[PDB]
Amino acid sequence: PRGSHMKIGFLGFGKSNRSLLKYLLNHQEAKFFVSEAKTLDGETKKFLEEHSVEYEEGGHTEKLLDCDVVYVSPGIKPDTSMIELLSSRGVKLSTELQFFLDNVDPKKVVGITGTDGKSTATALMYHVLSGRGFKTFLGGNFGTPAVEALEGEYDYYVLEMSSFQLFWSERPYLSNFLVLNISEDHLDWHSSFKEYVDSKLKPAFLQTEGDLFVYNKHIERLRNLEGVRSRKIPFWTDENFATEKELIVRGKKYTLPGNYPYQMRENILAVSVLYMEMFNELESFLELLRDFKPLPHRMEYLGQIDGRHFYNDSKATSTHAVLGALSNFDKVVLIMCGIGKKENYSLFVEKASPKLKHLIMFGEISKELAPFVGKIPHSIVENMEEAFEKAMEVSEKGDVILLSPGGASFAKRGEHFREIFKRHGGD
Numbered sequence: 001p002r003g004s005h006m007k008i009g010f011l012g013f014g015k016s017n018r019s020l021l022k023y024l025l026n027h028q029e030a031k032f033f034v035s036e037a038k039t040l041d042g043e044t045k046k047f048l049e050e051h052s053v054e055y056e057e058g059g060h061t062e063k064l065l066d067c068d069v070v071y072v073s074p075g076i077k078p079d080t081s082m083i084e085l086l087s088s089r090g091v092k093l094s095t096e097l098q099f100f101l102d103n104v105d106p107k108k109v110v111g112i113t114g115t116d117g118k119s120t121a122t123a124l125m126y127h128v129l130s131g132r133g134f135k136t137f138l139g140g141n142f143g144t145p146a147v148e149a150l151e152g153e154y155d156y157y158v159l160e161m162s163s164f165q166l167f168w169s170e171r172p173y174l175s176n177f178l179v180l181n182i183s184e185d186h187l188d189w190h191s192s193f194k195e196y197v198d199s200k201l202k203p204a205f206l207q208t209e210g211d212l213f214v215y216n217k218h219i220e221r222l223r224n225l226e227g228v229r230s231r232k233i234p235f236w237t238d239e240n241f242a243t244e245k246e247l248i249v250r251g252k253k254y255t256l257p258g259n260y261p262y263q264m265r266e267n268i269l270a271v272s273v274l275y276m277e278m279f280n281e282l283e284s285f286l287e288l289l290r291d292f293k294p295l296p297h298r299m300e301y302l303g304q305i306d307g308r309h310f311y312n313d314s315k316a317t318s319t320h321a322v323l324g325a326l327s328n329f330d331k332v333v334l335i336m337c338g339i340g341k342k343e344n345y346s347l348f349v350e351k352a353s354p355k356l357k358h359l360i361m362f363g364e365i366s367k368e369l370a371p372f373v374g375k376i377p378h379s380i381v382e383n384m385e386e387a388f389e390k391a392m393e394v395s396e397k398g399d400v401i402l403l404s405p406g407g408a409s410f411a412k413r414g415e416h417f418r419e420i421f422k423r424h425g426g427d
């Protein structure tokens, strides 16, 4: 009715609405208006001015009441004054996720939601679809907003979707919908648990018989899913579950490549079930799982030499991973090495300190750590052989010696450390 005089509003201007405005500037004839509660920085203003997008900052005014549609930033709360005025004046309210779901090919979307594990599970789905050779987009709440992907073409769009995005999405239709878990704590979400649940489950009740809904069966305690019309495959059942070492899908058993925490086992189970439904086969999934980056590393116990216990955490390539390994003991003689990531090690050192009987270092990471380590008994050596002997020398019967490097390299170091262990008589 209004041709190019359509007025499109943005309430809030975080990454969702910024990505959406950038898509619409290049795809739609309309007058655009951005409304920010705080101040916009200099770069953002220059950007809006370069494309003559009107804006207000320092408060939401009645200028938004003039809009034909307003896109709400996912973090905007439902009972705020501007939402109340907008609704009471009959202005249509939508959000960047809903726009995406209205514009993409529905059958190419894999929508993942959950309380825990959401980012890793989404990354795994992306990983295994990419590994089959599909051109695959990864984004959603934790990452790149989905509308970025509407430039060019993809085979699959793998989205992580939060309760906030789904709340503000009036009709969030997904052909492929995975719910990892729904849990009562901890929660970024404002208040009502029943609104949180209902927001997260919205897509399920929109599906048709040709669609797919894979879900954690514990959510059946919260909501009745009988009327959902899609192919529905629950996990944690008699046929779809995981124990510490095994994955069972359709009653079939597969050995997992390591013994992982509960959340990672659930992420694997969830994505398994969906992959098996899409491709009828899990051998390709398991092979691709092996190079999945967030996959926890094996901490291989090597054995003893003269009462000392050796653990090989060769794959720890960051401060974070070293802190993981450390939480398995109370005292340890620790060997670190490799190329230090650009970090601030004081946070790491104070967190590591109580667990360290002695720290041994070599490689360029020695230089990064040296300035913060005056606190604790420590030795800098030149290579792994020297590190090994120094570990034997500062240790006694009963101690644990742990290789957990913390830096990158140029199972090469791990192999080297194993070989040294053996040459000095290890088991």
Ligand SMILES: O=[P-]([O-])[O-]
Pocket (backbone or CB within 6 Å): 037, 060, 080, 081, 082, 083
């Ligand atoms: O945060 P507001 O719309 O009063």
Ligand SMILES: [Cl-]
Pocket (backbone or CB within 6 Å): 011, 012, 013, 035, 036, 037, 038
């Ligand atoms: Cl705002």
Ligand SMILES: [Cl-]
Pocket (backbone or CB within 6 Å): 012, 013, 014, 073
């Ligand atoms: Cl904002």
Ligand SMILES: [Cl-]
Pocket (backbone or CB within 6 Å): 016, 096, 097, 139, 140, 141, 144, 145, 146, 147
């Ligand atoms: Cl998004």
Ligand SMILES: [N+]
Pocket (backbone or CB within 6 Å): 012, 014, 073, 074, 075, 076
């Ligand atoms: N936000």
